[PDB]
Each structure stands twice: as structure tokens, then as C-alpha cells.
Scaffold this active site. Structure first.
Site, PDB file in Angstrom:
ATOM      1  N   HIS A  48      42.840   6.905 -42.652  1.00 25.48           N
ATOM      2  CA  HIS A  48      42.396   5.562 -42.425  1.00 25.48           C
ATOM      3  C   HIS A  48      40.966   5.468 -41.891  1.00 25.48           C
ATOM      4  O   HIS A  48      40.238   4.460 -42.176  1.00 25.48           O
ATOM      5  CB  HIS A  48      43.316   4.802 -41.445  1.00 25.48           C
ATOM      6  CG  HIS A  48      44.611   4.391 -42.071  1.00 25.48           C
ATOM      7  ND1 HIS A  48      45.373   3.305 -41.659  1.00 25.48           N
ATOM      8  CD2 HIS A  48      45.176   4.835 -43.207  1.00 25.48           C
ATOM      9  CE1 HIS A  48      46.450   3.201 -42.457  1.00 25.48           C
ATOM     10  NE2 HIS A  48      46.331   4.097 -43.406  1.00 25.48           N
ATOM     11  N   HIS A 106      51.627  11.822 -48.741  1.00 24.23           N
ATOM     12  CA  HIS A 106      53.073  11.457 -48.586  1.00 24.23           C
ATOM     13  C   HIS A 106      53.984  12.653 -48.804  1.00 24.23           C
ATOM     14  O   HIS A 106      55.205  12.527 -48.816  1.00 24.23           O
ATOM     15  CB  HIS A 106      53.409  10.238 -49.456  1.00 24.23           C
ATOM     16  CG  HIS A 106      52.713   9.004 -49.021  1.00 24.23           C
ATOM     17  ND1 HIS A 106      52.797   7.819 -49.707  1.00 24.23           N
ATOM     18  CD2 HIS A 106      51.921   8.745 -47.934  1.00 24.23           C
ATOM     19  CE1 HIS A 106      52.075   6.895 -49.063  1.00 24.23           C
ATOM     20  NE2 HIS A 106      51.534   7.418 -47.986  1.00 24.23           N
TER      21      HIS A 106
HETATM   22  C1  HEM Z   1      48.213   3.582 -52.289  1.00 26.38           C
HETATM   23  C2  HEM Z   1      47.803   4.179 -51.209  1.00 26.38           C
HETATM   24  C3  HEM Z   1      48.654   4.245 -50.001  1.00 26.38           C
HETATM   25  C4  HEM Z   1      49.537   3.384 -49.472  1.00 26.38           C
HETATM   26  C5  HEM Z   1      49.964   1.977 -49.885  1.00 26.38           C
HETATM   27  C6  HEM Z   1      50.033   3.994 -48.269  1.00 26.38           C
HETATM   28  C7  HEM Z   1      50.970   3.394 -47.356  1.00 26.38           C
HETATM   29  C8  HEM Z   1      51.401   3.911 -46.187  1.00 26.38           C
HETATM   30  C9  HEM Z   1      52.353   3.302 -45.297  1.00 26.38           C
HETATM   31  C10 HEM Z   1      52.826   1.872 -45.391  1.00 26.38           C
HETATM   32  C11 HEM Z   1      52.574   4.153 -44.287  1.00 26.38           C
HETATM   33  C12 HEM Z   1      53.512   3.933 -43.130  1.00 26.38           C
HETATM   34  C13 HEM Z   1      52.819   3.559 -41.826  1.00 26.38           C
HETATM   35  C14 HEM Z   1      53.891   3.502 -40.766  1.00 26.38           C
HETATM   36  O1  HEM Z   1      54.797   2.623 -40.821  1.00 26.38           O
HETATM   37  O2  HEM Z   1      53.773   4.373 -39.893  1.00 26.38           O
HETATM   38  C15 HEM Z   1      51.896   5.376 -44.640  1.00 26.38           C
HETATM   39  C16 HEM Z   1      52.083   6.551 -43.914  1.00 26.38           C
HETATM   40  C17 HEM Z   1      51.379   7.728 -44.192  1.00 26.38           C
HETATM   41  N1  HEM Z   1      50.407   7.937 -45.198  1.00 26.38           N
HETATM   42 FE1  HEM Z   1      50.083   6.614 -46.714  1.00 26.38          FE
HETATM   43  N2  HEM Z   1      49.539   5.286 -48.148  1.00 26.38           N
HETATM   44  C18 HEM Z   1      48.616   5.413 -49.090  1.00 26.38           C
HETATM   45  C19 HEM Z   1      47.795   6.482 -49.312  1.00 26.38           C
HETATM   46  C20 HEM Z   1      47.711   7.556 -48.343  1.00 26.38           C
HETATM   47  C21 HEM Z   1      46.825   8.621 -48.489  1.00 26.38           C
HETATM   48  C22 HEM Z   1      45.678   8.743 -49.476  1.00 26.38           C
HETATM   49  C23 HEM Z   1      47.058   9.523 -47.461  1.00 26.38           C
HETATM   50  C24 HEM Z   1      46.415  10.769 -47.145  1.00 26.38           C
HETATM   51  C25 HEM Z   1      45.825  11.700 -47.895  1.00 26.38           C
HETATM   52  C26 HEM Z   1      48.184   9.000 -46.798  1.00 26.38           C
HETATM   53  C27 HEM Z   1      48.862   9.692 -45.785  1.00 26.38           C
HETATM   54  C28 HEM Z   1      49.904   9.121 -44.990  1.00 26.38           C
HETATM   55  C29 HEM Z   1      50.675   9.897 -44.022  1.00 26.38           C
HETATM   56  C30 HEM Z   1      50.466  11.320 -43.631  1.00 26.38           C
HETATM   57  C31 HEM Z   1      51.571   8.983 -43.493  1.00 26.38           C
HETATM   58  C32 HEM Z   1      52.619   9.249 -42.436  1.00 26.38           C
HETATM   59  C33 HEM Z   1      52.298   8.829 -41.084  1.00 26.38           C
HETATM   60  C34 HEM Z   1      53.218   9.320 -39.968  1.00 26.38           C
HETATM   61  O3  HEM Z   1      53.894  10.369 -40.242  1.00 26.38           O
HETATM   62  O4  HEM Z   1      53.157   8.755 -38.807  1.00 26.38           O
HETATM   63  N3  HEM Z   1      48.655   7.912 -47.392  1.00 26.38           N
HETATM   64  N4  HEM Z   1      51.298   5.321 -45.815  1.00 26.38           N
END
Ligand code: HEM
Ligand code: HEM
Ligand SMILES: [Cl-]
Ligand SMILES: [Cl-]
Ligand code: NA
Ligand code: NA
Lengths: 713, 713
Positions: free
Chosen positions: B77, B244
């Protein structure tokens, strides 16, 4: 585009501390306006201004063939925004040329007046500021029309962006009182720090209070607003009647003919505004206030005809051609000249607020004296006009040029000349050691010097430690200053001083003002030693001691700190949160946000709090100069909650045990809450910061000690 | 407190040019972050970060015992706000810690993440910025969980106040499209420069477009927003599926339990926000996005389970416990671990936007290739992660420390190393003489060098004259660059270059990039001589020439000036007024308002307008370096009005005769209208200002010529 202000409209605004950077200033870093002004041929500028007075331009023809009245209004409005509560407003920065003042309804058509001065400004360039030129032009207007002024000083350096002044909370120009953002409450009490009755006015409404044409009630508003601009009854009558000796008002047609103010106008207006669709839009057809009054039979010459008319006629309520209330002389002949048609004459007319000068009983006595004794009137007006136009210039050391009046005036808070040799660096070291050997503590030393120096405000350049006025009334009895503790410190320093001065040859002596500041320096050095650090705090001698007789006690009242977050002090409960008051105080001290942050964190651990309060004293080595405030504030092992007794006091408990570690106020905890302030606290709370914290603290302490030292500038 | 912005909400904002002054910066003027970083023990920091991963704090307990997923999201982010349209956003200034980004809904609970890093930041202090720390921490999270990264560079200096970025005009967080301030028009066309679908999101809505759970339509928004962040289809699928692989979402209860974002929270929250009333408010009960998805059977270890799950199940639409749309695997067993309870397991789940990677036909092919060839997936993700987190760092010369990848990547706009002696001052003089003897005019020389250098933007540190990309596609064909004129100048300069290089010994040569700038400098010197001034313009050699193959033509498109007020150029008609576009371009060039003002007024008289337009050419001695622009613009003898044919072009006529003297655009006339700009123009239009104008022009010209010269930093 949506801004942070839109999302979080009550967050604290730190940008006010970072204005006036070298980034927005077109002049080099080395430009010194005083040096430029000192070589100006001031007499030449005045001859050009004298010529300009009767050189009419067709885009804004001169009434009576003479622009003197317009320029007098221009200069009076430049100076007339001044408020004693905070020192803000006034002529000293030339702010009339920037927003919002350039577009206030009371400043309508002064855009034309400033544009007339462009050729002269262009000719002399950096050697005369706009801020000085506006006042100088009003003096030349008066001189050209037969009035002898009291003098003039240059030295108002130009600024390059709008200042951040609170002018009120109304969202409508000229809104009448009693609205959702009313600046009045109770029995017509005007909110501090405001000094005008409606948003966009200089002092009062010329028709009367909220438009009601009652001269007796208008007089109450005149008195209150002028007192908030540092003027008493005699000065106020002298100014109003003196101004309205000259020129005329403009109200030839309905106000709905008048277009956008400068800030709202189209780009093609090139900085001008209030373009009027009424007839020619200018000259005989001009509309400025909507009133149509010409006070005297010789509007381009000093006279005593304002009071001859006020007292020689009875007055009838009437309407101008724009519909505004005003007054006309009953049974009079047409004796007042028309501004453009030499075959037309008019009856005498007055504003409601002119008639105040006859119908308010206390004004009436002054006005009668001035009518019977016009030489008394002329002298009062000249002195008042100098005071009005110089009130924010600061110490006499800032006054430049060949026309500075030699008479020292009480309102200048004057400082006597020094006529003896000053202490040298070895003397300063001897004095610091004697102070520390006296048994005066770090806390006492730092608290006394802070009390003395922190009265300074960069808005009007009043206050500061020069003068040693902290030992006089009323400063010695201000609650923030801890009067009994203060008296004890001053007695011990006065004994040190008597002994040092008694042992000198050659007339060397040290003033109490200097020794107060030096003793504070000794405290900071001792605090640094207590922490294990050897530092020298800079000190510059040359302050002198003012007498009680040279100190106007009532005028000093506005400098009392009722909120001083640096000492964790709030005299009572205010509607404005304490953190906002802290930032306002920092702005007056001329501090940036970094400087504010270091200063506060250091003062907390030195013992500077009023009353020895423990709030924000986040250390177990009080009186040692360390960064402990920041390290303990930022420690995530501590959880903070408002107390049940007081929502504005917070307890810091160990998160794991619940054990009470600290207490703090909003001023303390903002440093861990506001995202910009916390970023600054982090630098100083880091493990590598101890040396930086000490060096930065010393540098901001020395800055504060020197704020009023224009003798060294 | 009513402000100028409340009264004149469309007036232009110049404060954006004076941010980031030394006043708001706590570090000394001499602080050099690169030098501090180069002494950091980076290995030590990484050990501490590895320890942190599984050191759970009770105020925000770690999911699965490991903060890696939270930290990955934190770094993604930080970097994910980047937009290629203007280069704004990104990780490079650490702006996630200030408003508004600290409080965007998409950054909920990243406040907790940053607070967990405070002890490390405190321990290392100024030697590691927050901006570097956030990225380093994401890298360490990946390494800790078994993914080998492509590398890391330090050198992101911290900033100290919020940046002035246009994030959209909506007044409601997360507003869906089609409202009064919609960022969408036509057939789902997102307004430039925006790169997110709703206010407060990083890219897209995880439920689907405006909350509609259609994976095919979500894919279109993914593609468009990721392209606006410089990522193609391969990079996008790698980044989404890579991220993810780790961690989980948080949506244990209704979102109404979640309180104020950090900038709105109470002072006792000490900079944190989104405090939740749902059960314990944290850990197993956490609410962040409202969704409740865990993607893999090992959320704390790199795996190939993301694509095995996406392809291995069919998906059913369902709702989280907060009510949000998400997807669950039909007939699957409970194979996904719980984050806190070893006795609970869950079925595989997916977001709408995860399903896009299977149901969009172009993504499906990539996703399948990655599922069949996981080594290709791993390498793609590593490279994409590096690009994501370094995209705004600028030239490779800015990259610091021992983990910088040796491989040169096309997206870095690389510049070849110089491996020969540079020209010296004698050679520069000989080349300037050759340029002036060729018959190239002042206007051609200035215009070409301006075209070359003015592509620089300090937001992402792309563009500028180094590389001589003005001779390559697509710069050589940009309309603002006057392709035919440009071609002629380049041919003459390349012939000079060939002749100079042919005559050298010892390997000395001059690059075309250096010669273009030096030729520009000769033009400015010739222009000053034409005005009667003896001026030398500083020049620093050392630029090299990039090849076409080192220049990604599609990535270069975003540098095309569609508005350049300095050349009086506007490619078509925009909703944003041209003077706002000028200020925006000045901010990208890193200019203050005085620098913008001097630059523009000089360029006008030197002949830099596109197409030889006369607009703003307020001189009778074109190609001479004079302050004529200012003196003529401010002459009150000229009256200005918009033309009937075009309200954006103005005619300046003699006030007395009506005779046409000049024409100008909004960009020209703003300098005579805006109260702050006009105060600046007055300085340079004064009778004492000709030498000052010339010397300040030279300085700002040199500044622009050197903007990308980080090889000399
Ligand atoms: C279309 C693009 C994406 C969407 C809509 C998206 C959406 C989200 C959402 C809604 C969360 C949950 C937040 C929460 O409730 O804690 C999340 C978590 C996460 N995203 Fe994505 N994401 C996107 C792309 C990315 C990208 C590019 C990365 C990294 C390279 C990323 C890595 C993460 C990780 C590691 C988590 C987990 C967080 C945790 O374990 O606390 N995401 N994502
Ligand atoms: C109660 C306080 C005062 C009130 C309500 C007030 C009101 C006004 C108004 C309404 C105008 C007409 C503006 C126009 O239509 O052009 C004006 C003009 C003027 N005032 Fe005042 N005034 C005040 C005090 C002062 C003071 C203190 C001075 C200077 C010492 C001053 C000097 C002038 C002059 C010279 C003009 C004439 C401008 C011209 O000839 O264009 N006034 N006044
Ligand atoms: Cl002010
Ligand atoms: Cl940014
Ligand atoms: Na002031
Ligand atoms: Na950026």
C-alpha cells in the site's frame, strides 16, 4: 480537489508556522530592506507623490482634481485592521495588497489607489516597500493639503504571501450580528481577538450598529472597536474628525451595479475589482460604500470645517442614491463643492458615526474642545495619525530615515539608551557562575528567563525581555509568572547585580534585563551538565532597564499570557482547544513546528511548568536537559486515557500492569497524536538524538531570548 | 475560522510550490540522508526485522503468530498509490504516515503495522528513513516466509508534511461512481491523473466494480488501474497472486463496530485509529476490510497453493460476517488454518478480484502458465515486487546500499555509463562558438534545450535531458516539441558533434545530450549579449545518450506535455484552467513561485513559445534577455479583454486610443491578476531589476538543466 482540511476540518493547522519561507521570497537570502531604504532619496519620492496627488488618471478620475482623500483612506485602512489582543493586522507588512484584505468590502476601490502608486513603486524599486509606501503616501496627502504631520519612519519590509489571520467565522461578507457564526454574545460583547463589528469592515458600520442609524448606539461600537485598536476617546475623535476633514464618500447609484471584488474578478481585470455598470462607473458616478457625503467646504484643504458643520447645523435622516442611511443639514444652503461640476454645490452631510462625535456625551466634550481650539485638534490628530500608522512597527530601533520623530512616546514601550560599556565574555562567565553559586535552581532560572522573553509577539513586535518589565507592574503580578517565586528570584539576581556593578571600573555595568536572560542561559547550561553534556549557551548583552514611569500598565495588559502551552498554563477554560492556542503562541514567537516541539519537550523536563505541575514532566531526572519527554511520550508500553474528573487531563498507565506512570494535558499529548507533530517527536525521541536535541534546544532558547533585539539586527 | 479558500474556492493555490521548506524540516540544512544511510548496518536492521515478525504484541496480535502478511500489505500500500500520469504517489516519500493516506479506508490497521516498527525506527534513527523502512520491512516479511526477493535499494529520504496530491473530488469516502464529483465518465473512463476506482482505495474494489461481484467486469478495472500504475498483465497477475499467497483479510463482524480513522480519533488514541467495539477488537475479532478470506493452506509460507486453489475448485458467492461479497469453494473440505484457534479449519475462499485472474481470458492464460510453471511465477513476482517498490526512485544513481540488483531494467529508463574523458571548459567554449556560428537562432537553441530538460518531474524523478531521448521516439514526434523544427536543430547539432568528436584524441567525446544543453546555454548567453549584458551560463558535462532499445516508448507517453505554460502550450481544451496546469507543472519541475515567474517571463521573450505564437511575447526585442515581459504586462496604459472568438485569449489595447498592442493567454495574464503572482512580477518589472532578472533567470535555467543530474549529487 478534496483536501485534508475538507476531511478533518477541526485538525490543527501547522502550515501557519511555515509561512514566509525563503522559497516564496523573490529577494535574495542576503537582501536587507533596511540597508536599501537607508539609501532611498526619500525627498525625491515625496516630490513624486506630491505631483501624483493632482495628476488625475482617466481610468479613476480624481475627486476635486486631488487624490489626497482617497490616499488618506488607503493609509488609514492599511493601518486600521490592527487589533491589540494579538497584535495582528496593521500596516507593517503591507498585507492590504493580498487576500483577503485586498477584497474586503471596506477596502473597495483602494485597489485603484494602490494601482495609482505603481509608477512610483516601479521607479524606486526595492528601496521602498509597498508597506512603507502606503503610509508615506497618506502622509504626503496630508502635507499636500496643509496638515503638518508628526513624522514618519520607514522600515516595514514587504511580505510575499497572505498572513494567516483569524478575522472571524462568518461565511457571508458583512453578515449582521446574531447569525450562526455571530461574533457577538451577551450584551453586545465582541469576541476576542476581533476588533470590527462585521466581517469585512475596518471598525464599525457607517450607517449604525447592524444598519440602525442611531448615533448614540453607534458611539458604543466606535468606542469598543477603537479601544481594541489601542485608541482612547481623544484619539478616536481626533482621528475620525481629522480623516473626515478630507474628501468624500461614493454612492452615486445602487450597489447592485458593482461587480466582483478583486479576488473574484476575471483575469482581464488585472487585479482590480468592483467594476461598476452605473453610468461611467467612476469619477462622478463612483460607487464605493454606497453613501454620498462630502463633509467640508474645502475637501482638499485642512480646515476646522468638520466641527463647524457638525455643531453649526441640526441633522436630518436621509438616504443616499444607493439607499443607505445618512444625514443632511437642516435649512442649510448649498455650500459644499461638487467633485466634478464647478457649477453645482451641495448641502452639508454627515454619517451616523460622525454624529456620534456630537451625541455621545463623552465624545461631545472632546469634540467641543477641538471645535473651540482647533490647534489642539491638529496636534491630537497628528499624534494619533503617527500612532495609528506606526503602532505595529516595534521598538524604536526599527524606525528608519530622516523624519523619525525625536519625541519618545509612552505607547512605544520605550527602552532607555545604553551609555556605558557592556560586559564581555569573561564577565558573562563570571556572572553565570555567581548565579549558579547563589542556590537558584535550573527550574527557577529557566522559568524566570522564559517568563521575561516569551511576552514577545512578532505580529506587532511588542514584548520580550529587553526593558526588564517583568520586575514592574503589571508583569510582576501575572499569574503565569508565579509572582511570589518571581519576586524571590529577582531579589537574588538584583543582589548579584549590585555586587557585580559595585566592583567595576570604567563605568561598565550590567542591566537587570541582561542578567535575567544570562541567568536563564546559566540554567540551561547547568541542565545540560546535569545530563552529562558541556555546552555554552550564546548570550548577547545590551538590554536596558525601563522604569515604571515609562511603562503604560493598561497597554501592557494585552500581553498577558492567558494560554502558554510552553509552561502548560491555561488561565481559564476557552472554547478554542489548548493545542490550537499552543500553535497560535508558537506563531507569535515566530517558531516553526520543529522549533516548537524541541522547545516544549525541553521546557517540560527543565521544570518550566507553572506551579511545578507534573503534567507532561515525562522524566525521572527533572532539571536535566535530556530528550526524555519524547522517548517516554512515544513509548507504546504506556496507554493513555482521559480522567473522569477532567476530560482535558490524561493518565498514562503501563499497558500490561495498569500502574500509573504519568499525567498530561492536551498540549503534552498532541505531540503523540497529530501526525505531523508525532513525526517531529520521533526524530527527537530516537536513540541517536541526544546531541541533536541539546543543540536544537540551545538554538531555539537563544532565538527566543533575542526576539526583541532589533538593536543587534 | 474563515480562510481565503472558503471565500475564493477557485483561486489558484501557490502554497503547493512552497512546501517542504527548510522551516518544516527538523533535520539540519546540511543533513544528507544518503550519507546517513550508507553508514547504516543494514544487516543488523534486517535481523531486528526478522525478530519482529513473530514477536506478537497484545494490542494487535499477530495472525498465525507471524506479522508477515500485514507487513506485505503495508509495503504494497505504501507503493500502491503511484500513478504514471503525474508520477505522484508511491513509497518514495513515506507519505503513508501523514494525512490523508494514513487514514484512507484501504489503509485501515496499517497504523498498527507502522507502530510495530517504531522500536526499530527509534533504535536506528536518522540512518533509516521511514520511507525505506516500510519497503525493507515488506522485503524481510517475504524473506522470512520463504520467498527470495530480487533486491532492495535505500535512499528514500523522509518528508515532513503532507504532500499536495489531487486524489479526486469526491466529498464522501469510498463514494460509488456517477455522483456529483464522479471520477468516471463515458464508458467507465477514469479521469486522469487518477489511478483508483473509488476515493480512499489503492486500486480497485475487492467486491467488484461499485460493489457488484462480477469477476469479469472487476478484471477490467484491475487492468486499467494497474496500467495506470505502470504494470502490464503479467506483472499484475504476478503481484496479485503473489501477495495473496500470504496472510488473510479481516471481517469478523459488522463494520459499524469500527470507529474513527486516525486523523479523526481522539488525542488519547495517540495516532492510531479504527478502534473496534466488536468483541476484543483485534486478533481473531479483527475488522479491516470487512471481508473474511484466507487464501492458502500455509498463510505464513511461500507456496504454490494460490493457483492450485483458484483452478482446483468451483466458486460460490457468499457473504462475510460483515456483509461483504466474497467467494467459497464448492464442496471443499476445511483445509485452511485458523489464525488463532488450532482446532478450527476453514474452506478455501477468494475475493471477486482474485477470481478475475481465472475468468478474464487474458489473465487466465497467464495464471495457467504460472500454475504449470511455478518458477516462472516466482521470478515474475520477484521482479514485479522490486518494480512496484522502486518505481518512483528515479535513476539508478539514486539507489543505495549492498542489495541493489546489478541487472538494468528497461523500466528504469537507463542511461549508459560514461567511460571516456569529459569536455572541459575550453572545449565548452569552443562548442558554444560553433553552435552560435552555425546560424541556429536564440529561439531554436532555447526551445530545444527547454524541450529536452523540462520532461523532468520530481514526483517520480523521471525525465530530463540526460539520455538525449528527445532525439528518439516518442519525444521527437511530440507536438509540443515542434517535430520539424526539432529535427532541423538536431541535425545541425549532430553535425557539430561529429566534427568535434572526430578531431579528438585520448578518447574524449561529447554526448548529444550534453551538446543539446550546452547549445541552450549558448542561446541564453547570446540572448543576454543581445540585451547588452555579459553573462556566462554554468554548464556541467556528463550526460550520456540512451538508445532507442533502452527507451520504452509506451512508458515514455506519460511524460508528454499536454499543457506547458512555459511554452504557452495547450494540446486541447481541459476542464482544469490553464493557470492551474502551470502551477502543477511548476511543482513537477520543483520550482518556487518566484522561480516559475522569472522563468516564464524570460522564456516568452526568448522565443520559446510553440509555433512562434505571439501570445505573451510582450517585447519589441525578441531574442534578447530582458525583463520586458514584466514591465509591459504591468503597464496600466493597456486594457485587457477576452476576444469574442475565444474567451481564453485576451487582447491588450492602449487605454486612450483603442489600438491593439498585445495578445495573451490565461497563463500570461495570471501574472497580472493573481495577487501573489503580481507582487512577484512587480519585483522583476521595477526600474532597478534588469540585472536581477538576468541573474535569476540564469540561475533557474541552470536549475532546470540539471534536474535529473543525480550522477553529480
Ligand atoms: C486487485 C488488487 C488487490 C485487491 C482488490 C486486494 C484486496 C485486499 C483486501 C481487501 C485485503 C484484506 C485487508 C484486510 O481486511 O485486512 C488484502 C489483504 C492482503 N493483500 Fe491484497 N489486494 C490486491 C492486490 C495486492 C497486491 C498487489 C499485494 C502484494 C504484492 C497484496 C498483498 C496483500 C496481503 C499480503 C494481504 C494480507 C494482509 C494480512 O495478512 O494482514 N494484495 N488484499
Ligand atoms: C467610525 C470610524 C469611521 C467610519 C465609520 C468611516 C467611514 C467611511 C466611509 C463609509 C467612507 C466612504 C467610502 C467611500 O464611499 O469612498 C469613508 C471615507 C473616508 N474616511 Fe472614514 N470612517 C471612519 C474613520 C476614518 C479615519 C480614522 C480616517 C483617517 C484618519 C478616515 C479617513 C477617511 C477619508 C479621508 C475618506 C475619504 C475618501 C475619499 O475622499 O475617497 N476615516 N469613511
Ligand atoms: Cl497581519
Ligand atoms: Cl506524492
Ligand atoms: Na500586526
Ligand atoms: Na511520487
Amino acid at each position: 480537489g478534496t483536501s485534508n482540511r475538507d476531511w478533518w476540518p477541526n485538525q490543527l493547522d501547522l502550515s501557519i508556522l511555515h509561512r514566509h519561507s525563503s522559497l516564496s521570497d523573490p529577494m535574495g537570502k542576503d537582501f536587507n530592506y533596511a540597508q536599501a531604504f537607508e539609501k532611498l532619496d526619500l525627498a525625491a519620492v515625496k516630490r513624486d507623490l506630491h505631483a501624483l496627488m493632482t495628476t488625475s488618471q482617466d481610468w479613476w478620475p480624481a475627486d476635486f482634481g486631488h487624490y489626497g482623500g482617497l490616499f488618506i483612506r488607503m493609509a488609514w485602512h492599511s493601518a486600521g485592521t490592527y487589533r491589540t489582543a494579538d497584535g495582528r493586522g496593521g500596516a507593517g507588512e503591507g498585507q492590504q495588497r493580498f487576500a483577503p484584505l485586498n477584497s474586503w468590502p471596506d477596502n473597495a476601490n483602494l485597489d485603484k489607489a494602490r494601482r495609482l502608486l505603481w509608477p512610483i513603486k516601479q521607479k524606486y524599486g526595492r528601496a521602498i516597500s509597498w508597506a512603507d509606501l502606503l503610509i508615506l503616501t497618506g502622509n504626503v496627502a496630508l502635507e499636500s493639503m496643509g496638515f503638518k504631520t508628526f513624522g514618519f519612519a520607514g522600515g516595514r519590509a514587504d511580505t510575499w504571501e497572505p498572513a494567516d489571520v483569524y478575522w472571524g467565522s462568518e461565511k457571508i461578507w458583512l453578515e449582521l450580528s446574531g447569525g450562526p457564526n455571530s461574533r457577538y454574545s451577551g450584551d453586545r460583547q465582541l469576541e476576542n481577538p476581533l476588533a470590527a463589528v462585521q466581517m469585512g469592515l475596518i471598525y464599525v458600520n457607517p450607517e449604525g450598529p447592524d444598519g440602525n442609524p442611531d448615533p448614540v448606539a453607534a458611539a458604543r461600537d466606535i468606542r469598543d472597536t477603537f479601544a481594541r485598536m489601542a485608541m482612547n476617546d481623544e484619539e478616536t475623535v481626533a482621528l475620525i474628525a481629522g480623516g473626515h476633514t478630507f474628501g468624500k464618500t461614493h454612492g452615486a447609484g445602487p450597489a447592485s451595479n458593482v461587480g466582483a471584488e478583486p479576488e473574484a474578478a476575471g483575469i482581464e481585470a488585472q487585479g482590480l475589482g468592483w467594476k461598476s455598470a452605473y453610468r461611467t462607473g467612476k469619477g462622478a458616478d463612483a460607487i464605493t460604500s454606497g453613501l454620498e457625503v462630502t463633509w467640508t467646504t474645502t475637501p482638499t484643504q485642512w480646515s476646522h470645517n468638520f466641527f463647524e458643520n457638525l455643531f453649526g447645523y441640526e441633522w436630518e435622516l436621509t438616504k443616499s442614491p444607493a439607499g443607505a442611511h445618512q444625514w443632511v443639514a437642516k435649512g442649510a444652503d448649498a455650500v459644499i463643492p461638487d467633485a466634478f461640476d464647478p457649477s453645482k454645490k451641495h448641502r452639508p452631510t454627515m454619517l451616523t458615526t460622525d454624529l456620534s462625535l456630537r451625541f455621545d456625551p463623552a465624545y461631545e466634550k472632546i469634540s467641543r474642545r477641538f471645535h473651540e481650539n482647533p490647534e489642539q485638534f491638529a496636534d491630537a490628530f497628528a499624534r494619533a495619525w503617527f500612532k495609528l500608522t506606526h503602532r505595529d512597527m516595534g521598538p524604536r530601533a526599527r524606525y528608519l530615515g530622516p523624519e523619525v520623530p525625536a519625541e519618545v512616546l509612552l505607547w512605544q514601550d520605550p527602552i532607555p539608551a545604553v551609555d556605558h560599556p557592556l560586559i564581555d565574555a569573561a564577565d558573562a562567565a563570571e556572572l553565570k557562575a555567581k548565579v549558579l553559586a547563589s542556590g537558584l535552581t535550573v527550574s527557577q532560572l529557566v522559568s524566570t528567563a522564559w517568563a521575561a522573553a516569551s511576552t514577545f509577539r512578532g505580529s506587532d513586535k511588542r514584548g520580550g525581555a529587553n526593558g526588564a518589565r517583568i520586575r514592574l507592574a503589571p508583569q510582576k503580578d501575572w499569574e503565569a509568572n508565579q509572582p511570589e517565586q518571581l519576586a524571590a528570584v529577582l531579589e537574588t539576581l538584583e543582589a548579584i547585580r549590585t555586587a557585580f556593578n559595585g566592583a567595576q571600573r570604567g563605568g561598565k555595568q550590567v542591566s537587570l534585563a541582561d542578567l535575567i536572560v544570562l541567568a536563564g542561559c546559566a540554567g540551561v547550561e547547568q541542565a545540560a551538565k546535569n545530563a552529562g553534556h558541556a555546552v555554552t549557551v550564546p548570550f548577547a548583552p545590551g538590554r536596558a532597564d525601563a522604569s515604571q514611569e515609562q511603562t503604560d500598565v493598561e497597554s501592557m495588559a494585552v500581553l498577558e499570557p492567558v494560554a502558554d502551552g510552553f509552561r502548560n498554563y491555561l488561565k481559564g477554560k476557552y472554547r478554542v482547544p489548548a493545542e490550537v492556542l499552543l500553535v497560535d503562541k508558537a506563531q507569535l514567537l515566530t517558531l516553526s513546528a520543529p522549533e516548537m516541539t524541541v522547545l516544549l519537550g525541553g521546557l517540560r523536563v527543565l521544570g518550566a511548568n507553572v506551579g511545578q505541575s507534573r503534567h507532561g514532566v515525562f522524566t525521572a531526572r527533572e532539571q536535566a536537559l535530556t530528550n526524555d519527554f519524547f522517548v517516554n511520550l512515544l513509548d507504546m508500553g504506556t496507554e493513555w486515557k482521559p480522567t473522569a474528573a477532567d476530560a482535558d487531563v490524561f493518565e498514562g498507565r503501563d499497558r500490561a500492569t495498569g500502574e500509573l506512570k504519568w499525567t498530561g494535558t492536551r498540549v503534552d499529548l498532541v505531540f503523540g497524536s497529530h501526525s505531523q507533530l508525532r513525526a517531529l517527536a520521533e526524530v527527537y525521541g530516537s536513540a541517536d538524538a541526544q546531541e541533536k536535541f541539546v543543540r536544537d534546544f540551545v538554538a531555539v532558547w537563544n532565538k527566543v531570548m533575542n526576539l526583541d533585539r532589533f538593536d543587534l539586527a
